[PDB]
Structures are given as C-alpha cells and as structure tokens.
C-alpha cells in the first residue's frame, strides 16, 4: 500500500532527521526493489485510462498501485507489474487505439517494459534473461 507512495519512508523526514537516515551506513548500497514505476503524460486519453482502467480494474488486480498527481504527469508505482491493454483503452475511448497510440503519452518506465500484441507491460521481471521475449 503506502510503501509505494512518492513520499514513502525516508521521504517523510525533514531536516536533521532526513540526513541521519540518508547517511546511515545501511543506505550506502542499493536495495533490490520488486516495484515498477510508470509515468503517464496527462492528456484526455490518459486521464480516462487512469480513472477507468488503472484505478479500477488495475488496482483490483494489483492493490499495491499508488497513483500520484505530479501536475503535468501521473506518477504510478506498483509491485511486480502493471498491464495496460490498448484494446481495452480503445473501447473506453470509442476510437481506434493501438499499443503504439497508447505510447504517445507513456512518458517513462522504471522497469522492464515491452509491447506484445495490444498489450503494454511494465514488469519487475528481467525480460530476456529470466523470461524470453516472443513474437505474436
């Protein structure tokens, strides 16, 4: 839940309290994360996908999803993976919408992201190393 918030953990502390944890010796090495981060540019299409796909059936299948308003974009962090089927977004929008149209406003991915068929997947999985990529 709240461990995927933008201001989770050390990000809540201020002043000397933040510095003490920032410079704590356990925090001088990276810590493996199972999370993925997805950034979506705000746009008519994206705003509909956010409310009717990500925040409904998306969070229903992945309750770890946090979505935050960053003025010009949506910041999304979740455990494991996030999936957006462009065919479903097309039905929501009432207009042709391929996975490549979806990518018009997908602004960033911290994770392994790939296009397969109508689906856009961002996943913590090491695609190509632990799980092979395929064709249609």
Partner 1 sequence: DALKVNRAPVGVEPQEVHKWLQSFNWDFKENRTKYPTKYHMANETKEQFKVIAKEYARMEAAKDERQFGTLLDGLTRLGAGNKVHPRWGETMKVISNFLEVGEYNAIAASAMLWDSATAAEQKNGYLAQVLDEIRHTHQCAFINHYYSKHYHDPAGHNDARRTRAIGPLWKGMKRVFADGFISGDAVECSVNLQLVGEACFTNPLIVAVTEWASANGDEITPTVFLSVETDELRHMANGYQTVVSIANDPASAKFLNTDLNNAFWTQQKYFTPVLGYLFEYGSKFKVEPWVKTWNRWVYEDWGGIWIGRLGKYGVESPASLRDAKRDAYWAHHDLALAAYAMWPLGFARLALPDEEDQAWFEANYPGWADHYGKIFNEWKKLGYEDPKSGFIPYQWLLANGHDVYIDRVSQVPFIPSLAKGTGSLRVHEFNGKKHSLTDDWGERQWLIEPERYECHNVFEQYEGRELSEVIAEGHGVRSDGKTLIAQPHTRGDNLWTLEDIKRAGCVFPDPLAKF
Partner 2 sequence: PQSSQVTKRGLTDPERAAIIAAAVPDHALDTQRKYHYFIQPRWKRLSEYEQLSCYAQPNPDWIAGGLDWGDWTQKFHGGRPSWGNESTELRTTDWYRHRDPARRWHHPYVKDKSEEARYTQRFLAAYSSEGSIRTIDPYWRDEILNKYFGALLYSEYGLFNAHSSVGRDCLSDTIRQTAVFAALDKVDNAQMIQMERLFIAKLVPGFDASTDVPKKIWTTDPIYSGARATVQEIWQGVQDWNEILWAGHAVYDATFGQFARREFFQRLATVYGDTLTPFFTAQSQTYFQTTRGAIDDLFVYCLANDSEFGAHNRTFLNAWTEHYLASSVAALKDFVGLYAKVEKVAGATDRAGVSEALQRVFGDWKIDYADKIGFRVDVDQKVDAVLAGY
Spatial CA neighbour of 23 closest among 35, 13, 37: 13
Which of 94, 129, 130, 136 contacts partner 2 by CB under 8 A? 94
* Cα–Cα nearest to 81, from 24, 120, 116, 134: 120
- Among the listed residues 21, 69, 103, 104, the single contact to partner 2 using CB under 8 A: 69
Minimum distance of partner 1 from residue 36's CB (angstroms):
7
**Contacts with partner 1 in 69-108 (CB under 8 A)?**
70-73, 77, 100-101, 103-108
Distance from C-alpha of 81 to C-alpha of 70, rounded to nearest angstrom: 21
C-beta of 7 vs 27, nearer to partner 2? 7
Residue 89 contacts residue 45 (beta carbons within 8 Å): yes
- The distance from CA 16 to its chain's CA centroid, rounded to whole angstroms, is 31
Residue of the chain from 95, 103, 116, 128 that contacts partner 2 (CB under 8 A): 95
Question: Distance (Å, rounded) from C-alpha 135 to C-alpha 6?
Answer: 35
Residues within window 3-32 making contact with partner 1, judged by CB under 8 A: 6, 9-11, 14-16, 18-19, 22-23, 27-32
Question: Residue 76 or residue 121: which is nearer to partner 2 going by CB?
Answer: 76
Closer by beta carbon to partner 2, 99 or else 112: 99
5 binds partner 2, rule: CB under 8 A: yes
DSSP E strands, 56-111? 66-69, 73-79, 81-85, 106-110
Q: Which of partner 2, partner 1, none does residue 105 bind (CB under 5 to 8 Å by kind)?
A: partner 1
């Amino acid at each position: 839940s709240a461990h995927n918030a933008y201001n989770a953990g050390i990000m809540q502390k201020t002043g000397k309290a933040f510095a003490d944890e920032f410079f704590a010796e356990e925090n001088q090495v990276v810590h493996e994360s199972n999370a993925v981060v997805l950034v979506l540019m705000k746009s008519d299409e994206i705003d509909a996908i956010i409310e009717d796909i990500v925040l409904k059936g998306g969070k229903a299948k992945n309750p770890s999803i946090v979505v935050e308003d960053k003025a010009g974009f949506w910041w999304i962090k979740a455990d494991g993976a996030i999936e957006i089927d462009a065919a479903e977004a097309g039905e929501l929008l009432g207009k042709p919408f391929s996975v490549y149209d979806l990518l018009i406003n997908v602004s960033s991915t911290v994770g392994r992201a790939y296009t397969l068929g109508t689906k856009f997947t961002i996943t913590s999985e090491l695609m190509g190393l632990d799980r092979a990529l395929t064709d249609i």
